[PDB]
Amino acid sequence: DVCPLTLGIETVGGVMTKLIPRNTVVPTKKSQIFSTASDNQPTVTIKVYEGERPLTKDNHLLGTFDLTGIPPAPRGVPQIEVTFEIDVNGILRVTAEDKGTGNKNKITITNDQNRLTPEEIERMVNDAEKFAEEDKKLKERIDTRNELESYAYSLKNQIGDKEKLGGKLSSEDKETMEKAVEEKIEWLESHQDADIEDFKAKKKELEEIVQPIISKLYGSENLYFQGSNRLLLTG
Template sequence: LTRAKLEELVRPIVERCAGPMRQALADAKLRPEDIDKIILVGGPTRMPIVREFVKNFMGKEPERGIDPMECVAMGAAIQGAIIAGEIKDVLLLDVTPLSLGIETLGGIFTKIIERNTTIPVRRSQIFTTAADFQTSVEIHVLQGERPMAADNISLGRFVLDGIPPAPRGVPRIEVTFDIDVNGILTVTAKDLGTGRDVSVKITAPHRLSKEEIERMIKEAEMYAEQDRKRKEEAELRNEAESLIYTVEKALKDFGDKLPNNVKSRVEESLKKLKNALTEKDIQEIKNRMEELRKVAQEMGMVIYQQSAQQSSSSSSSKTVDADYKVVDDSKKN
């Protein structure tokens, strides 16, 4: 077998490396010229065709002073020494191969730690309740790249209870993801009002094969447009539900002060939007939301004007009539 024939056989395989290399640069938000050194790993990288391909792609010659057959074992030994505390002046960084997060209202996957974040790492986000007087929340921990929770890998669930009853949106729940140097994930949910918290440890949050990780990333790319539409619909429905809640609360608090015609229009618009939410027509939901916003704005103007009139009337009632006389200071003395 000649070198020319071998290179002819392996060239299609070598050229397939271009995709993962582009993806790695994109994930790191880097350009080829931003890379300082290139280290090749594994025996096949000794082949001239591989080195030439990398050089042409990156515009830089790969390092020659590091043995590609030994570098992985040496790196593992150094990392072991760092963990054992025997080496303190070298830092090796591992990364999360897939994003980590939780399921939120509407089945949306909300990322807390993005893919390719270096570990150890700690990230937190503030969430709240989705219903009035909710006294507990379920935290569903997931791993993946798809925007909808159902399309990602479930890592576990746990419940934070003992939340004091309050209107939706009032409680503040801090969710923290903490990955240590060993890759152990600890998820904590804390009610900032009471200080009560619950934690769960996940010892192998990303123990997936390289092939499984690559498949999940490719699926996220393949279904990107479809997923975008699904997420947009879920977010729109969440927004519609929030609008309904806000308007109904205002109607409950100030409904007795509204003219019947305004109140009727608000109630009718609420009914139309609720009906639209039972269907799949996204444009209809948008139209009904816009209609409800307009009548809600009209309702707000009426409430504001009535409040202003009451405030003016109250100020007038406090005016005191009094007699007075003008004193000419020039006539003094």
């Protein structure tokens, strides 16, 4: 037996993130490490969805649960492992664990809880075929946006981290780059609608300030700063 629909969770931006792909045989176990969407975020909300659309508003909610007691850390560093366990019966168990503290939380979802009619399931597949290219383009834009944000958040963290980049750095380099990533982050908050080229343009701008600095803090001109690309969850 296989999964009728792709299973996953909602990430920042109402974004569907795949955990169990459609037509995956049961039983199966699949996991992915996520992180916080906010600085000093003590809680992450896990929302479970089924569907083939890039935005969770077009998919179907199966359930939700919280993971609390997360130690104060910058955005993107808490290690939240989310696991999807399906057994033969169709029982879905979703777990969220902090890899640092070992604090878990779980939800058990039975196939009868919020069961979709076969007409609903087909309509969801028909929609994913009908909007296949529009959803293909939206996904690539979302991936480009999240990459720029990962790159922006990682920098702001490293600039503050004395054990790594912040230690090697100096002023005016520290003030130059902090102001620069702050200006890009402020832009992002009011430009989630932006097209692929605008996201791509804003990064190349941030890089032409970061790279000349990185190139001389360390020896090579072949060293580039890159973000964790960790997907984020709201709380």
